[PDB]
Design an enzyme around this catalytic site. Sequence first.
Site, mmCIF file in Angstrom:
data_model
loop_
_atom_site.group_PDB
_atom_site.id
_atom_site.type_symbol
_atom_site.label_atom_id
_atom_site.label_comp_id
_atom_site.label_asym_id
_atom_site.label_seq_id
_atom_site.Cartn_x
_atom_site.Cartn_y
_atom_site.Cartn_z
ATOM 1 C CG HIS A 65 71.188 59.994 57.091
ATOM 2 N ND1 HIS A 65 71.196 59.296 57.786
ATOM 3 C CD2 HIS A 65 72.424 60.741 56.858
ATOM 4 C CE1 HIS A 65 72.176 59.406 58.476
ATOM 5 N NE2 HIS A 65 73.674 60.136 57.356
ATOM 6 C CG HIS A 67 75.600 63.596 58.834
ATOM 7 N ND1 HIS A 67 75.337 63.640 57.603
ATOM 8 C CD2 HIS A 67 76.448 63.694 59.660
ATOM 9 C CE1 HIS A 67 77.154 63.522 57.263
ATOM 10 N NE2 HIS A 67 77.814 64.017 58.754
ATOM 11 C CG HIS A 110 70.447 65.274 55.017
ATOM 12 N ND1 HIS A 110 71.092 64.584 53.883
ATOM 13 C CD2 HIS A 110 72.062 65.150 55.422
ATOM 14 C CE1 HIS A 110 72.067 63.414 54.272
ATOM 15 N NE2 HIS A 110 72.242 64.070 55.226
ATOM 16 C CG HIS A 112 70.698 59.999 52.505
ATOM 17 N ND1 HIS A 112 70.505 59.370 51.345
ATOM 18 C CD2 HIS A 112 71.840 59.580 53.130
ATOM 19 C CE1 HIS A 112 72.065 59.120 51.167
ATOM 20 N NE2 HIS A 112 72.616 59.728 52.617
ATOM 21 C CG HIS A 397 85.465 63.101 45.606
ATOM 22 N ND1 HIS A 397 84.631 63.817 44.817
ATOM 23 C CD2 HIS A 397 86.427 62.500 45.585
ATOM 24 C CE1 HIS A 397 84.575 63.283 43.710
ATOM 25 N NE2 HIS A 397 86.338 62.810 44.152
ATOM 26 C CG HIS A 400 78.845 60.767 56.027
ATOM 27 N ND1 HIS A 400 78.951 60.472 57.515
ATOM 28 C CD2 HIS A 400 77.717 60.238 55.805
ATOM 29 C CE1 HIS A 400 78.181 60.383 58.148
ATOM 30 N NE2 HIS A 400 76.877 60.100 57.487
ATOM 31 C CG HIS A 402 75.237 56.969 56.905
ATOM 32 N ND1 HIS A 402 73.691 56.666 56.832
ATOM 33 C CD2 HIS A 402 75.596 57.172 55.871
ATOM 34 C CE1 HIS A 402 73.200 56.675 55.337
ATOM 35 N NE2 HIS A 402 74.159 57.827 54.530
ATOM 36 C CG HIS A 452 77.333 58.116 50.802
ATOM 37 N ND1 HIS A 452 77.377 59.768 50.463
ATOM 38 C CD2 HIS A 452 76.583 58.071 51.565
ATOM 39 C CE1 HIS A 452 76.364 59.990 51.736
ATOM 40 N NE2 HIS A 452 76.046 59.366 52.075
ATOM 41 C CB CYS A 453 81.476 61.347 47.683
ATOM 42 S SG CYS A 453 82.402 63.064 47.342
ATOM 43 C CG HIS A 454 77.273 63.985 52.793
ATOM 44 N ND1 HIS A 454 76.357 65.051 52.345
ATOM 45 C CD2 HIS A 454 77.462 63.560 54.133
ATOM 46 C CE1 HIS A 454 75.618 64.531 53.389
ATOM 47 N NE2 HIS A 454 75.899 64.208 54.295
ATOM 48 C CB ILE A 455 80.172 66.189 46.646
ATOM 49 C CG1 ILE A 455 81.359 66.652 47.055
ATOM 50 C CG2 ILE A 455 79.995 67.012 44.885
ATOM 51 C CD1 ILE A 455 82.521 66.967 46.426
ATOM 52 C CG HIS A 458 80.365 63.795 43.409
ATOM 53 N ND1 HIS A 458 81.718 64.742 43.371
ATOM 54 C CD2 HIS A 458 80.370 64.387 42.447
ATOM 55 C CE1 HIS A 458 82.095 65.271 43.109
ATOM 56 N NE2 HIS A 458 81.225 65.517 42.579
ATOM 57 C CG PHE A 463 82.070 58.200 44.309
ATOM 58 C CD1 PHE A 463 82.837 57.116 44.564
ATOM 59 C CD2 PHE A 463 82.976 60.350 44.870
ATOM 60 C CE1 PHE A 463 84.437 57.492 43.723
ATOM 61 C CE2 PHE A 463 84.492 60.105 44.592
ATOM 62 C CZ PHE A 463 84.611 58.345 44.178
HETATM 63 CL CL LIG Z 1 74.792 59.100 59.807
HETATM 64 CU CU LIG Z 2 82.760 63.543 45.782
HETATM 65 CU CU LIG Z 3 74.517 63.952 55.659
HETATM 66 CU CU LIG Z 4 74.881 60.424 57.176
HETATM 67 CU CU LIG Z 5 73.900 58.649 53.072
#
Ligand SMILES: [Cl-]
Ligand SMILES: [Cu+2]
Ligand SMILES: [Cu+2]
Ligand SMILES: [Cu+2]
Ligand SMILES: [Cu+2]
Length: 497
Positions: A65, A67, A110, A112, A397, A400, A402, A452-455, A458, A463
């Site tokens: 992905h 980001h 990163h 995904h 949290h 994020h 997309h 989603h949470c980007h942790i 999670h 999540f």
């Molecule tokens: Cl994105």
């Molecule tokens: Cu989280």
């Molecule tokens: Cu990302």
């Molecule tokens: Cu993204």
């Molecule tokens: Cu994502």
Amino acid sequence: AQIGPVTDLHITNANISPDGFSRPAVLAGGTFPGPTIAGNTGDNFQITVFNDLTDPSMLTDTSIHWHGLFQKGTNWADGPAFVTQCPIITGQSFDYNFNVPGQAGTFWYHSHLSTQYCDGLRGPFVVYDPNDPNASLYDVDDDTTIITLADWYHTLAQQEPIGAAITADATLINGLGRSFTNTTASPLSVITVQSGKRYRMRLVSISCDPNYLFSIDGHDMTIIEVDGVNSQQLTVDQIQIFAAQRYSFVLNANQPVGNYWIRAQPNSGGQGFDGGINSAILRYEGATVEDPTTTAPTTFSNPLVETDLHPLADLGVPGQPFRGGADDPLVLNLAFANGRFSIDGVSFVPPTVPVLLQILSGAQNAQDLLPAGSVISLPSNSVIEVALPAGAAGGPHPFHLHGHNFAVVQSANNATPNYVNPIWRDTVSIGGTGDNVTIRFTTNNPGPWFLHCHIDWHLEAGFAIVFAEDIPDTASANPVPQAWSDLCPAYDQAHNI
Ligand SMILES: [Cl-]
Ligand SMILES: [Cu+2]
Ligand SMILES: [Cu+2]
Ligand SMILES: [Cu+2]
Ligand SMILES: [Cu+2]
Ligand SMILES: *[C@@H]1O[C@H](CO)[C@@H](O[C@@H]2O[C@H](CO)[C@@H](O)[C@H](O)[C@H]2NC(C)=O)[C@H](O)[C@H]1NC(C)=O
Ligand SMILES: *[C@@H]1O[C@H](CO)[C@@H](O[C@@H]2O[C@H](CO)[C@@H](O)[C@H](O)[C@H]2NC(C)=O)[C@H](O)[C@H]1NC(C)=O
């Protein structure tokens, strides 16, 4: 050197020792972090990703992905596994061919797929602006002014035991740092500046989990960009940066020639700086090659507060200036129990058929889309509001979205919304118990967009939801290349699905 906008990118396994402890990793370009992918605003990126992975302990499939890049008309290139594509199998390659109209700033890339980016597949992605409105604020902006902050684990991501707490073993700044336990005096990163010059430092959190309190002894930092969005100048002496966020700041090399500590304190893992953990070195040209002797203050004078940030351009806020003042106002019920996260009562488990492929095959409402209850349709050309009230364990949290950036109408730790001039960004901390962080955007980008949470731990624990934005126009808006159409049959054959 930077690579791109047209480049190959090989994904391999290798041993690395960024904190003195050797472990295998999943790497782009042979390094941690991966090489910087760069180009100019509006460029055509063609990133041919070669999956050369052979070690199943970190997964031999991959998907990447980009980001923060909106992928308008190229949803198939966005990267989230089982949302926009099936993974690329080992021994195969895939051309991510997309354009970046209307965007310029600091991004990253990163894996995904699962928690694979934690195992090393993470790197910076910069889209320069030849006509940057902030150009006159600094002298230097290049690969030497990118600062990555990363968590690093001795235990492999797939091997983190069920039922035990996950914390990192080192903070890495530009790929180097020291371990929190059994600390050894491994090399620290050095960021070099020349007395009198001004630098556009591009601060990138490539974290899988922790947020960092980032500072530079003796210096302050003038923020000019937030997650790709130019800001008015905001001078701070500490930045709390959450997973996947980016800032640019002007660093004025206006202190005496010397060595100064760069500090990145995670919210979990090792506390403080004993033995040089959580540290890097800012070295002026002509300084002695030795560690800094500076200290941090006890209390920072001007920490970043998100509500202090404002766009450089007149971006405003879409919709009407009150809660629910949108065409499609949503309030998500974000929860955690018994090892799993949920959104509106549904824990995300990736589907067998990617959401985009389900849509292209004729599934045309969100109740038809798998996973059931995890895909929410959004109408076209509409103002969307999403309230994200905090309280779920494991916070704060960083959520994020997309395909989009968004106005942050309400920020962490402050009950007052801003319908006038809040910052826009793409990853936002939802804060603490009782908060009501709220985002707004307009739907002008047909396709399925992950929220989603980007942790990453999670996300793996559920999540997430998918916003199926403008289902009726997804197929016409996003023509797919044959190579993309070939991914699912290849993957399913390889995995006996
Ligand atoms: Cl994105
Ligand atoms: Cu989280
Ligand atoms: Cu990302
Ligand atoms: Cu993204
Ligand atoms: Cu994502
Ligand atoms: C966060 O803000 C949202 C609105 O953006 C609140 O949502 C309302 O919730 C109440 C019940 O709690 C419903 O009666 C309304 O229909 C919702 N929408 C409105 C008023 O626009 C939500 O309660 C807020 N959450 C927290 C924890 O403050
Ligand atoms: C809490 O958030 C609000 C909303 O973003 C902040 O209020 C703004 O404060 C600025 C600076 O004084 C004013 O120019 C704006 O008119 C305010 N907007 C609104 C809608 O009230 C507020 O400063 C934040 N609180 C703290 C302590 O930072």
